[PDB]
Amino acid sequence: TSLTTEDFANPSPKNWQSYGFDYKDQVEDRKATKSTFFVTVTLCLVWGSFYWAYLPDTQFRNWAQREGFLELRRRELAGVDLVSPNYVDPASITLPSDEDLGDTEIII
Amino acid sequence: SAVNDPLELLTNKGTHEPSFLSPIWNPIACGVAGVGAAIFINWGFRKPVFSGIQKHIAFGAIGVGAGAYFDQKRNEYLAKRDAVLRHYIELHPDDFPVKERKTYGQVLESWVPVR
Amino acid sequence: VLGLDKRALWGALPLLGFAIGHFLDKKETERMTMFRDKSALYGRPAGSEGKAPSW
Amino acid sequence: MLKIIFFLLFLIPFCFINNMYWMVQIMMFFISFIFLLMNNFMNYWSEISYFLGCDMLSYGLILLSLWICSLMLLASEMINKHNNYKNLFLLNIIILLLLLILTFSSMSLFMFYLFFESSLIPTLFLILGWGYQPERLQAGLYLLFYTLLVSLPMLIGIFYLMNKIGSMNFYLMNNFMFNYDLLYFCLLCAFLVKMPMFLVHLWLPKAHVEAPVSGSMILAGIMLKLGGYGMLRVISFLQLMNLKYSFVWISISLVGGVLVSLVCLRQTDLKALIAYSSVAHMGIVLSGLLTMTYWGLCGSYTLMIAHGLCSSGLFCLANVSYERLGSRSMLINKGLLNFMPSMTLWWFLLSSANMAAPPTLNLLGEIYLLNSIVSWSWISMILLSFLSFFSAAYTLYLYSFSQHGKLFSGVYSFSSGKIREYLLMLLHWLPLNLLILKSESFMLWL
Amino acid sequence: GASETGGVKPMVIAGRMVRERERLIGMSPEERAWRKQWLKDQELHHGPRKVPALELELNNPIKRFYRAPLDKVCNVLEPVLGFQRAYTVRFWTGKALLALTGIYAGAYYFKYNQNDWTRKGGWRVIHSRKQCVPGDEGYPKVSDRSAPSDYAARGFNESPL
Amino acid sequence: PRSPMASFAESVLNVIDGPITWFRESIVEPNQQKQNWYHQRFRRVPTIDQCYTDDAVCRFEADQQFRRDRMVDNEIVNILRQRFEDCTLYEAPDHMVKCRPLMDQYEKATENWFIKYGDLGGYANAKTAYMKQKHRLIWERRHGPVGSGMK
């Protein structure tokens, strides 16, 4: 129409602007906005990230570091190389003698 | 044991416990299928999907009954199948000789150095 | 603050699927009891064993 | 693991009840939260249920899908606004998500393939059903037929592996190393297509430009990863054959990444440019993956997570601009900083992440693939320098050109950005940063 | 319905004359009159009015309370110094208080929860050796760390295990 | 506190330390409860060599054991790096003489680490690592130590 200086200064609580979640039912639009924020933020990001931080040591990475110290002290004291170059002791292994190989390709 | 006897491998012992869904999945699957099939028919005819529940119960009931019957026959077919294999192994002990189980100590296969 | 209504009452049905889903796999773990407290890395010492099995 | 599956299945009926569009995402977001609590996984498989397990590799990819597939519903609010078969649309995503969850949670190689492709058809419906431009046909076939043409031969390669291994389970397969040349090409040329590789990418610019916003999310978000995820499982027993032909793939992807970056600079379409940016980064992912080193493997897993969130994010913004300006061409879209200044912030952060800007999870993965490639051969420093340089050349052109200049002249009046759009952008980017704190979990899958 | 524009029917009013070149080349008498009117309207002879509605529509309940207490000292002092002067005291008494508590939490954390050998995360400190100069205690001072176990102990030497 | 500022420096350190120690002693520590937590111990399990070529549980047993030992061995190197890390910072400017032995410990560990887990890439497992050793030993008796070439 021909709105006045007070129709712009006395906001009519009749029309409404939508928050992008609905365009027909005003209470529906606010209702979806509120619930969507709660789960996405108050639970997934706040509670999720909190719970993540106190998650139990599941990869055994903190546990390793404890071994890396205890295991290092025991073997630094034991006169053994700090990292064993053998997955199993060489003398325990039984090499196939040369005649057994018969030109099998050997790689390093 | 260190032995690889094929007849031992086939022969059952009762240790295995079939899963919970095993004795009920075929009945329950067919039962749901029957009901769901009845749901189309109403939808296809633009009838209320839950109208005429008589047909739903029949299709659901018929589904369960058929599922149980065929499941019963299935196990006989599987039971017979292994019975054939066990009998055939016994008849030709030479073609399925007992083999010894090597361990990685007595083998030298290659490895793949990524570098 | 939630802004939830009676329509979310239907949400119980998906939550029903959760419990049923939880129940089955929990029932599956009770079918997994032949290396339970028997493996070389967690197997109980031979003799004078705990009455209730771990997990 | 069945907790997730049966939750989704019983959410299928929500597609049929009316006025349940918004109650769906909450059930889809809530399940992500529930899934977010059950992280106690390891390198080996865990939580067995009849054939469904999950290790650290599968977990992150599953959780990525639940997040992305949940954002699809936020992004595609226009489907709800015009009741454009919304009920069918919802059922498409719920079905599609289930196929993804099974695909990653499958423990046997045959299953992975069974749900690998099966997810395609729900995507194909998505493009045709809700795409605007007429070309969704001629882009609908490319997506379907490039994939089927190279996936059907993969099916033979899968069956040939039973008769040798005797099983499909991934752990049992790793004990073998195969020497047959063709078998190598029947389990990687099928995934090299979906990555995509530079020379077989011709479907990607067509599918992404034409697909709706939601289809763009999942196509760029999870479909490009199924190729990547598949490789991570099947190079374990192709190590020997991988060494004879890797240099072919590394060169193509590396040179392919550079050449595509120049192609990006000569684009004039937002959707096209973002899609071609996917091929650029996916070239580094594939390159590092085939290096097979510890770094190249962990890094590739990381970057796939990060890139999906970003490229999915950048498709939000193109849709926002396209929704109002009505045209997706760069010439129409100018100076948007002077129409929607609040929006331009999100343009930058998502754009910056795409160019490996810190502290994003994207830079963590990209540092690693770069390490593996360099270790693979010092000659790789040449283009790997070019590719990282040009990977910012088009990103600035994408951001600066669309946000900075003077406003378009012919544009008619349009709405400003809404809260939904801002909330959508936050959920894309904000995890992409906070994930750096707990990269512990989404990195060390080996 | 949800009217984004609030009823007011959006349009473009300024017309051609916004662009400088479109003005220089020529302007009909009506356009010149219209252009003159447009500029005369852009003048505002008052500052923006204070709308009560915004101040609640853009302040969540948590914030309205989280700040409530220190807004009482703004209300107490605002007749003593003027609203500008008093509010500045409200802003700096508050924002500075956060800093003071910020250091103490930081100071606390680096004194007890510093990274140790039983965790990987957390901040890890390796300080150097202070310059010992004449007059300081025991001038011929030497680094007590000799054996390799001394270095990077991370509190491991004093563990019970 | 021979310096003026150092006299002022200590004044602040009293101000920031005083409360936190009181707060730690007044509230946090006194109100807490006594509770003990332990350290995982893993019984050594048979190596991959004892495993048969057809059983998977025994292979799975060793593969996990190999991986756990890898972590312990990955970071026993990390600890040794931090020692040379810390000596260089605690001994400068004269740190070359003192870090030199520590770096010698570090470099040896890396080589032993690289002889064992090296060059396997991802997917390295008990089988692959053990088989590298078998091939390495065969080459050693035939061509002598690596780096000397073949005959």
UniProtKB/Swiss-Prot annotation, chain D:
It is an enzyme of class 7 (translocase). Disulfide bonds: none annotated. InterPro entries: NADH4_N, NADH_UbQ_OxRdtase, ND/Mrp_TM. Its EC number is 7.1.1.2. It is a multi-pass membrane protein. Its main location: mitochondrion. It is found in: Mitochondrion membrane. It catalyses: a ubiquinone + NADH + 5 H(+)(in) = a ubiquinol + NAD(+) + 4 H(+)(out). GO terms for cellular component: mitochondrial inner membrane; respiratory chain complex I. The chain crosses the membrane at residues 4-24, 56-76, 93-113, 114-134, 139-159, 182-202, 218-238, 245-265, 272-292, 297-317, 330-350, 373-393, 426-446. GO terms for biological process: aerobic respiration; electron transport coupled proton transport; mitochondrial electron transport, NADH to ubiquinone. One of its GO terms (molecular function) is ubiquinone binding. Keywords: Electron transport, Membrane, Mitochondrion, NAD, Respiratory chain, Translocase, Transmembrane, Transmembrane helix, Transport, Ubiquinone. It holds the Pfam family Oxidored_q5_N. Belongs to the complex I subunit 4 family. Core subunit of the mitochondrial membrane respiratory chain NADH dehydrogenase (Complex I) that is believed to belong to the minimal assembly required for catalysis. Complex I functions in the transfer of electrons from NADH to the respiratory chain. The immediate electron acceptor for the enzyme is believed to be ubiquinone. This is NADH-ubiquinone oxidoreductase chain 4. The gene is mt:ND4.
